Amino acid sequence: GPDPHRCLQFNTGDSIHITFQTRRYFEFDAANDGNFDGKNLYCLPLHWMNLYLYGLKSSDSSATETQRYKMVKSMMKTYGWKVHKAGVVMHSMVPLMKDLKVSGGTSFETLTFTDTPYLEIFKDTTGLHNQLSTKETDVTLAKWIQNPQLVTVQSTAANYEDPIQQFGFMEQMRTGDRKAYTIHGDTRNWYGGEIPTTGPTFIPKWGGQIKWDKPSLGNLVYPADHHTNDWQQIFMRMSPIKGPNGDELKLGCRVQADFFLHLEVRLPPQGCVASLGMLQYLHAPCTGQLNKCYIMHTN
């Protein structure tokens, strides 16, 4: 039979799950400054946890933490967390143009005549780049939340066709389309620390130049055995339309972007003191800079 003297055993490793969800408006043009070129593309870093745990303050559109992040921030920081899945779906595109003008007046923005204009989406699958800089080096987290920011992919690309000649992956987005991109985080470890407003924290992934760090008092755990499948962030630009006579149209578009992230947070132990054991297994996530773009290549 049962042990009449069995003692209550405390739970170990139990956790909770929190889902983050939000919606945003994004606008895009041909990523040009004057005549079309192939120097920049808008970048959407889906791997940046910051884009999901933060939102915009209604009064000044500044970056502010979501109620959910705010309420579990302390627990995350101390006991650890994992990111299972996260992603975005862009849809409901609305094409725009600024080619109409009044006599002795300037061009004004309007809807487009038809639905022929489209957005171009790229991924560096052939291994062109390792590290890039934002066109503006003073970009803030708020800006990124407001919209994907421009990244210089080829400072010397006067030829606007460079992107379509170089990027391995390419697809178009037009009215009626739905474009979904997701990322699954590595779940072998628990990660510690908060997700600051100063630097992007990457959803746990291991490959190429990308790597997370070992615990303060513990061995590093990672996939050393083989090359993992690399994950690519996306780059975009409204397709730059040139006419047969060299005329360049002024087109752009606005889309709705729905975001989601599934977070799992570790619970504190039973008792009345903060433990210390987690120092042996809590890994430190990889981080970057608001004005930098790191592309993973495992092959």
* Rounded (5°) CA angle 117-292-156: 60
Three-state SS for 166?
helix
Tokens found for residue 211: 């790597």
Q: Which of 50, 148, 273, 292 binds its own copies (CB under 8 A)?
A: 273
Is 69 annotated as contributing to ligand binding? no
Is 181 annotated as contributing to ligand binding? no
Number of residues in contact with Mg ion, rule: CB under 5 A? 7
Q: Scan residues 194-233 and list those touching its own copies (CB under 8 A).
A: 206-211, 215, 217-227
DSSP H or E stretch at residue 78: helix 67-79
Residue nearer to Ca ion on the CB measure, 125 or 197: 197
Give me the least distance between CB of 199 and its own copies, in Å please: 20
Give me the least distance between CB of 153 and Ca ion, in Å please: 19
Check binding of 182 to its own copies (CB under 8 A).
no
Site string for its own copies, 69-98 (x = CB under 8 A): -xxx-xx-------------x-xxxxxxxx
Give me the least distance between CB of 164 and Ca ion, in Å please: 10
Check binding of 125 to its own copies (CB under 8 A).
yes
Q: Which residues touch 235 (CB under 8 Å, ≥6 apart)?
A: 41, 42, 43, 44, 121, 122, 123, 124, 151, 153, 163, 167
Site string for Mg ion, 51-90 (x = CB under 5 A): ----------------------------------------
Check binding of 199 to Mg ion (CB under 5 A).
no
Is 161 annotated as contributing to ligand binding? yes
Check binding of 284 to its own copies (CB under 8 A).
no
Site string for its own copies, 157-176 (x = CB under 8 A): xxx-xx-xxxxxxxxx-xxx
Amino acid, single-letter form, for residue 107: S
Check binding of 28 to its own copies (CB under 8 A).
yes
Q: Which of the ranges 102-110, 133-141, 192-200, 285-293 carries the binding residues for its own copies, by CB under 8 A?
A: 102-110
Q: Scan residues 248-287 and list those touching Mg ion (CB under 5 A).
A: 250, 252
Give me the least distance between CB of 126 and Mg ion, in Å please: 19
Q: Which of the ranges 49-57, 133-141, 191-199, 285-293 carries the binding residues for its own copies, by CB under 8 A?
A: 49-57
Question: Which residues are part of a known binding site for Ca(2+)?
Answer: 25, 146, 161
Contacts with Mg ion by CB under 5 A lie at 98, 243, 250, 252, 288, 293-294
